[PDB]
Design a protein around this ligand. Structure first.
Ligand SMILES: O=C(O)[C@H](CO)OP(=O)(O)O
Ligand SMILES: O=[P-]([O-])[O-]
Lengths: 246, 246
């Protein structure tokens, strides 16, 4: 599988901080045919970020609308993303499910709209602390993945992300071994639902706390194909996280 | 009061269509010291739009986060807007109340963040067909305005918009006089919750259907200080709607 390292800048940045951060990223010599490196700035920072990053970096946005063009004040359609050659979208991030009540059906509709417009999708899911302590991790992830997985018609163009919500902001820690087991089962669902080749092709990223210290322990696991990185991707040392995939 | 004519492009535009439309808008000679004219493109179109419009046109975005900077994937904070010199935000548009379940409390929180970060805000509210048919227009608008109105300190920098939801896709039609009656009531609510001077300063825009054939009849009404214009603002003839306020 081609490894995939993504920077989710979330709701952070200034014009000047992005100028310095993108300059630092550009100093890393990597081959984009060997690994994908994608930066997801805030929507209003996209043009600045895409201009400042060298062409080896891919870019995307952090959300996309389930509606197409029309009377949807504040939304960005997949059609507008296509017209701007915004290559990737994040869908289903836990912060959208938590604060903006995004549902599995919304994730399905956004994936559908994205694929129809030739956008590549980074689709997020994962179980809560209570679900995990109830031994419901596989029931929860299965339902979340089955909400959308039958739409995938090209297994390079959809990238899955496991978010261990039980170990985000809970004072709990996931280990590489724990993450590897969930990733194996995610790949088993894709297998079940879409077939063995397709399952062995798709990228499944880890979306819990990634930093320069733990990144290699994660990506060296057999079924962990890269990361969706949050706060560590706002630092110049994010290049060392990319190096773990090189 | 200075009149205020705003283009809510909603979720519409291509880079090419915006190049043509902004060129047509730039041909209109008007004096921005006498009239505010504000364009609200989609977030990922903002940079292109602001570079293409002469500064006589003010610009803004169609939504803003209720949260500040941080782990809010997909949101745009008021701090980020301010660093980009985005001048205006729309808050509380009925489409966000409808499709994204934005509440009065969300509107308040977005307004507080916006004003904290020295943005100007276009704040929308209005009653449904059922509410009007139950004779609850004033009760409903009083509650919607009182959810946020105490946050306003500079009554030039918050602009209210009445959206007659009862006449939007209902087959019902608001006459300019019916609009005027609600605008006068909104101004009375501001007078009694804030003060007389405050109420006489604040702009109250009509946010129902505005086109080249009705704009003159609306802006002549005493308590109508401009418009938040939808589909008609995607047309070159929007310049004639601007002229009606000149
Ligand atoms: O990966 C995301 O996009 C996350 C959600 O937590 O951020 P972090 O890497 O800091 O945990
Ligand atoms: O966009 P509205 O005036 O129909």
């Amino acid at each position: 599988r081609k490894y995939f390292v993504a920077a989710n800048w979330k709701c952070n940045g200034t014009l000047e901080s992005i100028k310095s951060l993108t300059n630092s990223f550009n100093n890393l010599d990597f081959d984009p045919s060997k690994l994908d490196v994608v930066v997801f700035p805030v929507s209003v920072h996209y043009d600045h970020t895409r201009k400042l990053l060298q062409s080896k970096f891919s870019t995307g946005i952090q959300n996309v609308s389930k509606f197409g063009n029309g009377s949807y004040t504040g939304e960005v359609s997949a059609e507008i993303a296509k017209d701007l050659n915004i290559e990737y979208v994040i869908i289903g991030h836990f912060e959208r499910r938590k604060y903006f009540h995004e549902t599995d059906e919304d994730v399905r509709e956004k994936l559908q709209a994205s694929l129809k417009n030739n956008l590549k999708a980074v689709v997020c899911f994962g179980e809560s602390l209570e679900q995990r302590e109830q031994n419901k991790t596989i029931e929860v992830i299965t339902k979340q993945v089955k909400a959308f997985v039958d739409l995938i018609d090209n297994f390079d163009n959809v990238i899955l992300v496991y978010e261990p919500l039980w170990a985000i902001g809970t004072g709990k820690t996931a280990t590489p071994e724990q993450a590897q087991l969930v990733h194996k089962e995610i790949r088993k669902i894709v297998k079940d639902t879409c077939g063995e080749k397709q399952a062995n092709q798709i990228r499944i990223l880890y979306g819990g706390s990634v930093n320069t210290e733990n990144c290699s322990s994660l990506i060296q696991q057999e079924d962990i194909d890269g990361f969706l990185v949050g706060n560590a991707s706002l630092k110049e040392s994010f290049v060392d996280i990319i190096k773990s995939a090189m």
